[PDB]
Amino acid sequence: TALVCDNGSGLVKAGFAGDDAPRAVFPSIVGRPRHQGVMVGMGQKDSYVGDEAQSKRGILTLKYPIEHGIITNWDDMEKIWHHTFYNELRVAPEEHPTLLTEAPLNPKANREKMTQIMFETFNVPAMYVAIQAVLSLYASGRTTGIVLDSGDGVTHNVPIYEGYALPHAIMRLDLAGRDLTDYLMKILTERGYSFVTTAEREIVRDIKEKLCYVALDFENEMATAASSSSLEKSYELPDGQVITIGNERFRCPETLFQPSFIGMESAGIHETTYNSIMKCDIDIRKDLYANNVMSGGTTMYPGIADRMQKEITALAPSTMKIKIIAPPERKYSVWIGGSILASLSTFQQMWITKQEYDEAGPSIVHRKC
Amino acid sequence: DVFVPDDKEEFVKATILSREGGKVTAETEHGKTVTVKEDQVLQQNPPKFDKIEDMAMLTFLHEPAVLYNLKERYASWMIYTYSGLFCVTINPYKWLPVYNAEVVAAYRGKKRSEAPPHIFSISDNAYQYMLTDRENQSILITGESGAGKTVNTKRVIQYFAVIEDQIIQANPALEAFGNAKTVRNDNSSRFGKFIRIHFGATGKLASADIETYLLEKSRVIFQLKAERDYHIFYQILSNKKPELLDMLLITNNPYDYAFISQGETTVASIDDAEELMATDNAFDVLGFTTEEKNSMYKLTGAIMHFGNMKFKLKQREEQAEPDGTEEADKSAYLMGLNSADLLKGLCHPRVKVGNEYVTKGQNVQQVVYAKGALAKAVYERMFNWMVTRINATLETKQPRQYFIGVLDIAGFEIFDFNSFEQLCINFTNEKLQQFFNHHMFVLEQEEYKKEGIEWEFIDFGMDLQACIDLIEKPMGIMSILEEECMFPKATDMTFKAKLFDNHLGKSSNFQKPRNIKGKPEAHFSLIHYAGTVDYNIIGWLQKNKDPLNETVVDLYKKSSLKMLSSLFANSSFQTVSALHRENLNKLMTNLRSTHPHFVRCIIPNETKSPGVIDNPLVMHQLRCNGVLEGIRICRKGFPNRILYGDFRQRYRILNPAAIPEGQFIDSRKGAEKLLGSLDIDHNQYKFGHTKVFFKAGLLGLLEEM
Numbered sequence A: 001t002a003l004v005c006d007n008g009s010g011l012v013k014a015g016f017a018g019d020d021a022p023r024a025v026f027p028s029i030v031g032r033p034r035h036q037g038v039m040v041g042m043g044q045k046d047s048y049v050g051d052e053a054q055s056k057r058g059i060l061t062l063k064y065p066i067e068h069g070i071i072t073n074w075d076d077m078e079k080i081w082h083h084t085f086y087n088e089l090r091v092a093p094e095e096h097p098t099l100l101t102e103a104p105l106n107p108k109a110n111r112e113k114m115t116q117i118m119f120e121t122f123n124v125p126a127m128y129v130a131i132q133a134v135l136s137l138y139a140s141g142r143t144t145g146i147v148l149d150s151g152d153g154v155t156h157n158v159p160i161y162e163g164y165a166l167p168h169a170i171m172r173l174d175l176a177g178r179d180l181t182d183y184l185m186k187i188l189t190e191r192g193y194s195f196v197t198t199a200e201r202e203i204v205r206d207i208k209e210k211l212c213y214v215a216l217d218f219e220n221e222m223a224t225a226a227s228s229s230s231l232e233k234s235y236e237l238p239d240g241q242v243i244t245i246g247n248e249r250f251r252c253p254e255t256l257f258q259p260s261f262i263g264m265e266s267a268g269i270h271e272t273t274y275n276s277i278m279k280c281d282i283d284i285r286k287d288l289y290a291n292n293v294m295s296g297g298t299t300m301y302p303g304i305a306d307r308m309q310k311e312i313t314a315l316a317p318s319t320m321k322i323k324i325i326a327p328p329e330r331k332y333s334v335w336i337g338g339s340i341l342a343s344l345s346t347f348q349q350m351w352i353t354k355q356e357y358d359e360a361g362p363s364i365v366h367r368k369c
Numbered sequence B: 001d002v003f004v005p006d007d008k009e010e011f012v013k014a015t016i017l018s019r020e021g022g023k024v025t026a027e028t029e030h031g032k033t034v035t036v037k038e039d040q041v042l043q044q045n046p047p048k049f050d051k052i053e054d055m056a057m058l059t060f061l062h063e064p065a066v067l068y069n070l071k072e073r074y075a076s077w078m079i080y081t082y083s084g085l086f087c088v089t090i091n092p093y094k095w096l097p098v099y100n101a102e103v104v105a106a107y108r109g110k111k112r113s114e115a116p117p118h119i120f121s122i123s124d125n126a127y128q129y130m131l132t133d134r135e136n137q138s139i140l141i142t143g144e145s146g147a148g149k150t151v152n153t154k155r156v157i158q159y160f161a162v163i164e165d166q167i168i169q170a171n172p173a174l175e176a177f178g179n180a181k182t183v184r185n186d187n188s189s190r191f192g193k194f195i196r197i198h199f200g201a202t203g204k205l206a207s208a209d210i211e212t213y214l215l216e217k218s219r220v221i222f223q224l225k226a227e228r229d230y231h232i233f234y235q236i237l238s239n240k241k242p243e244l245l246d247m248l249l250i251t252n253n254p255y256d257y258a259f260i261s262q263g264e265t266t267v268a269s270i271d272d273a274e275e276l277m278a279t280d281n282a283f284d285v286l287g288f289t290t291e292e293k294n295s296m297y298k299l300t301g302a303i304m305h306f307g308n309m310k311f312k313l314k315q316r317e318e319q320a321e322p323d324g325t326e327e328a329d330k331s332a333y334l335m336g337l338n339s340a341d342l343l344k345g346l347c348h349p350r351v352k353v354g355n356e357y358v359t360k361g362q363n364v365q366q367v368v369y370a371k372g373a374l375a376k377a378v379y380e381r382m383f384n385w386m387v388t389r390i391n392a393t394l395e396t397k398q399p400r401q402y403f404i405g406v407l408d409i410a411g412f413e414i415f416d417f418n419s420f421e422q423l424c425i426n427f428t429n430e431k432l433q434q435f436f437n438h439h440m441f442v443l444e445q446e447e448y449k450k451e452g453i454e455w456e457f458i459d460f461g462m463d464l465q466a467c468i469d470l471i472e473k474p475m476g477i478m479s480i481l482e483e484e485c486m487f488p489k490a491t492d493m494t495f496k497a498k499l500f501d502n503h504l505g506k507s508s509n510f511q512k513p514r515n516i517k518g519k520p521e522a523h524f525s526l527i528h529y530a531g532t533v534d535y536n537i538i539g540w541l542q543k544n545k546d547p548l549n550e551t552v553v554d555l556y557k558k559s560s561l562k563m564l565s566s567l568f569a570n571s572s573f574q575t576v577s578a579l580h581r582e583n584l585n586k587l588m589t590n591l592r593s594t595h596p597h598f599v600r601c602i603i604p605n606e607t608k609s610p611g612v613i614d615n616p617l618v619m620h621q622l623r624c625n626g627v628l629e630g631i632r633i634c635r636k637g638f639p640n641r642i643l644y645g646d647f648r649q650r651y652r653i654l655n656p657a658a659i660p661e662g663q664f665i666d667s668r669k670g671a672e673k674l675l676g677s678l679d680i681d682h683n684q685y686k687f688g689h690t691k692v693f694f695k696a697g698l699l700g701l702l703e704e705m
């Protein structure tokens, strides 16, 4: 029973090998107080982590140490590691092999130093970082297809056929989950509300969590909700106010399907995944279209499966069956697959024991994965 | 002839064929032939040092020495044994000529090392000190009735009176309000009762007055679920003598009430069902009018009877209204005072100003705390007033001024799931050891001064001060609870967070345990000499919060004679910690103004088989009692009390010869060539007044050959 702990920027999720459900999951916020201490004897904590920190955002500043699949400001991410191991999952790492997760190709130096930091101080027995998509694949029991996890920090595609991780068509994209929230900030300024600070900026992803459904034929649905007041929806902040969101409701997620709104000049996800399809052989396209699997988070938006099916079948020749696999086990499929992989006995020989690292130097992760 | 760290006891006699590499081959006394680790293998003291009545003359002074010597001496059915200043007894239970009339007037001199080990001797030497220095003396009884002691000073006091029976008569009654069954070693009187017997300048007994010290005031409420409350509560419980219950309006069911229901109330080993007759009879024949006699029952019942009180949270507001008028009214009648004004004084206490307007304010939580505080205080003060009455029926009018006092204190406590109570009791128990260490250091200081060469490390008390500061010294530990109850929103976890912030690493005695196998998880640990302690601080903030509400106190005057009498005689919100610290300082002051001596008790086993040792227990008590700590003091230091002539006599194996018993290199001819025989370190011994102390241990090997 080793361990499995996701790295992804949004929600550091911790659990045990084999178990079908992460034992503890919490947002990866790291907080610091932004005001002087006034009631002597508080015994203030000098930093806060996770849902404890999220509890009292009122006097807190929020640093996400994980942006775009790059681990920045390593001090706080180490703090998150430390809080995870001891408080959430509650075992010393000294007696548990550990496995982490990592986006396709983020930088070179990232793993090459992260293995060191988590392998020298925490003094873990053994570790092996596994690229996200191949892990997502096992999680669903399909050993052939294209993965689109789009974990909040980064979105990417891989072609995987008959269990081969065909590298060169890996098509990464930085259309992250958080940036939908950030754009929603700018679109919500227009209806007259304002969300300047950081705490409210955290709230808005929550308000995004429920009220963002992507709709087919964006033009017609847009003019539809413009003409009729049918879908005018309401919601309340933990303030007392109630906020009325109009067509922003379905103008949020469509930044995914076209980035012209956010500005980035890189085609929407459907065109990228079709691209990565068309950058393989003329025989692998027979099956690839059939096993398309969503994964990660940021795809729990209702409808996105169907809209995706429409766009692809329009793009691909209308002689293939594009039936896409979108189980509702999403947002965790990363972790399920990770646990299953840690459960494979043949997998035991793979990862790196302390001896190899000590006698070989840090590069062992890249050299042996 | 060596010692082996065997699994069960780790301090038993061994037999080495040899030892090699790290793994000793040896045939053990505990079992069969085995192999064992070297480092903890210890060495047997020579026959001339071996089997000495004092545990201060055994070269390898280590713990195995005092262990096996006790095991053998009690195996030979000896009971009296000397261990440094401490005296050790086991008091077997099948009759032996132990209280023989020959010794009773016998040991009239022989200060401490001139007669066979015997404590009547040292008590009589205290009598002699009284004759000479005319100054008070103090008996230091370790261990409680749970340690099988009760039958020792009951005889020792008569012994001292020989050179009267009213003293015991208090015991049967005062036990009922003071004996409390615990998790381990049940049926222990947890209250301290210093007992002094007064002598005038003459020496004929004039009187003996008794004052209790540091009663466990928090036992009344929030007892541990596993344990049980004071014996008196279940005495009153049993239907036997139901007429007193008829006076007391109790329903005769333990689990009805809040305070009792925490207890187990079903202890098949010992219940006061028979004892209620004896306690009532003593409580009568000790000179009690029937009015005070049944009034005592009235107050004891009412202390239970509050447990039925129930309060509700007021609408759109904060203070508490009273619920359950009928039980409040039964209580009110029971103490006579009106119910309406009592509940009102609960819901709106008075706090003075430069002129005392009827100020007001409370909250439900505060009320539930405060009423319990009031109950605890009234019970404790009731108990002390009964002590006053016991003085009253024993009053004297002779000129009594010089007393030799026996004090009984709770023993050192280390067992499972120890909350605040254990911390308090352990601190109290160890302060007396601080007193002992300083005292023996003073005497040995002047003695070695007469032989003055150089002292190792003054003030043996530092060894304990290192943890005394941690427990008490401002912003230590005990102070943190005082501060934490005051601070708003008392939460249990924040307490430990503050402790870890403030005294981890900063204090070299405050650390954390790990995976205590089956006993529930303690939070923080301390390294005492006697044993590393482990506590979980759940409920501490509740335990020590106790606001002594005034308005009810002033309301109490217009009722039965007892309660006004009790509470008429006698502020930063006193909480058990502060009261406790102050009272302990009072006690140590009273011992500061006296002189000590030490009497201990040893339990053989739970099976109660007299005459035979059982190692699992005795090792724990000996380690806990601190006799091993005194042996530690002697071992690391000079204190090995040796005649210089004794050393010159015993050392002839290195002065090539065989014949002992004098007639070789004597006192005046040594420390010249002797250590040069086998090249022993210099200046570990000299003759100043021909009395020499030692760094002993080097003197075991040299006489085996």
Ligand SMILES: Nc1ncnc2c1ncn2[C@@H]1O[C@H](COP(=O)(O)OP(=O)(O)O)[C@@H](O)[C@H]1O
Pocket: A006, A007, A008, A009, A010, A011, A012, A150, A151, A152, A153, A154, A177, A178, A205, A208, A209, A210, A296, A297, A298, A299, A300, A301, A331, A332, A334
């Ligand atoms: N109700 C919801 N509907 C849609 N998306 C959501 C909802 N709740 C959270 N999310 C998104 O899921 C993201 C988490 O995905 P990510 O962190 O990339 O994967 P992982 O948590 O496995 O690392 C969050 O950033 C958030 O934007």
Ligand SMILES: [Mg+2]
Pocket: A008, A009, A010, A011, A012, A152
């Ligand atoms: Mg995440």
